[PDB]
Write a protein that binds this ligand. Structure first.
Ligand code: ASP
Lengths: 165, 158
C-alpha cells in the first residue's frame, strides 16, 4: 500500500493535489493566450489606422489571423481546465473565472469580427480593458484560493479529498 | 533527517518561483498591450476623442513594466535549486532582452517615434522569453514530481 511519499502518504492524495496544479496551469495558459490575443488585435487595429502606403500596414491581416490562432489555443486550454473536476472548495472561484472568461472571450471574438472588415470604430468603442482587468482579478483570486487549498491538502492526511460532483 | 519538512519547503519554493515568473510574463504582455493602446491613440491624434489618453496609456505601460520587474526581483530572491540554475540563467538573459525591448518601445512612443516603435522585432524577443519560460517550466515540473513522490536524491534539494 503506502507510504507513497512524505508529502503524499497515499498516492490518491498526489492525484488530487496534482489535479489542482494542472488546473492552475491550464488556466495560466488560457490567460497568457487571451493576453496574446489582445496584443495581436491591437497590433492589427493600429495598422488598419495607417495609410496604405506605410509598409507597416501590410501585416494587419497576418496579425488578425494570429489573433484567431491564439484565441483558439486559449479556448483549448480553457476546455482542458473545465474537463478537470473541481474540488468543492474551488467550485465558487471556478464559477467566478467562468463568468469573467466568457465575458472577455466573447469580447475578443467580437473584436476579431470588427477587424475582419476594418471596422476600427466598433473596435475602439468596446470597453475591452475593463473586461480584461476583471478576468485578471478573477485569475488572481483563483490562484490564491488554489495555492491555499494545495497547502491544506499536502499538510492534511486526510488522503480523502473527493472531487465535487 | 527532516526529509518531509525539507520537501514541503522546497515544493512551496518551486511553486512560488513559477508564480512569480507567471506574474512577470503577464505584466510584460500587459506592458506590450498598453504600448499598443497608446500607439492607437497617437494614430487617432489631436482631439479625435480617445486620443487625449496617449500619455495616461504610456504611463500605464511604465507601471506594468515596473510591476513586472518587481515580480522578477521576487523570483530572483528565491535561490534556484541546483538543477534549475541553468534554466534560471536562460530566463535571466531572455528577460533582460525583452525588458530592454519594452523600455525601448516606451522611449520610442514618448518621443513620437512611431516608425522605430513598429519596426522593432518585439515578437521575436517575446517568443525567446516565452521559450525560456517553457524550458524552465519543464525542468521545474521534473524536479517537483520527483520531490513530491520521494524520487529525488538529497543533492537535488536537501
Ligand atoms: N513592435 C511593437 C509594435 C508593433 O509592431 O505593433 C510590438 O511588436 O509590440
Amino acid at each position: 500500500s503506502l507510504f507513497f511519499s512524505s508529502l503524499h502518504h497515499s498516492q490518491k492524495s498526489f492525484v488530487v493535489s496534482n489535479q489542482l496544479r494542472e488546473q492552475q496551469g491550464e488556466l495560466t495558459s488560457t490567460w497568457d493566450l487571451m493576453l496574446q490575443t489582445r496584443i495581436n488585435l491591437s497590433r492589427s487595429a493600429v495598422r488598419m489606422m495607417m495609410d496604405s502606403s506605410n509598409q507597416q500596414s501590410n501585416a494587419k491581416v497576418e496579425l488578425l489571423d494570429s489573433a484567431r490562432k491564439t484565441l483558439a489555443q486559449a479556448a483549448t486550454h480553457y476546455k482542458k481546465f473545465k474537463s478537470m473536476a473541481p474540488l468543492p472548495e474551488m467550485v465558487a472561484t471556478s464559477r467566478n473565472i467562468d463568468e469573467k472568461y466568457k465575458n472577455y472571450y466573447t469580447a475578443l471574438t467580437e473584436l476579431i469580427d470588427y477587424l475582419d472588415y476594418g471596422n476600427t470604430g466598433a473596435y475602439f468603442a468596446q470597453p475591452t480593458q475593463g473586461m480584461q482587468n476583471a478576468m485578471g482579478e478573477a485569475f488572481a483570486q483563483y490562484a490564491l484560493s488554489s495555492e491555499k487549498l494545495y497547502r491544506d491538502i499536502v499538510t492534511d492526511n486526510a488522503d480523502d479529498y473527493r472531487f465535487a460532483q
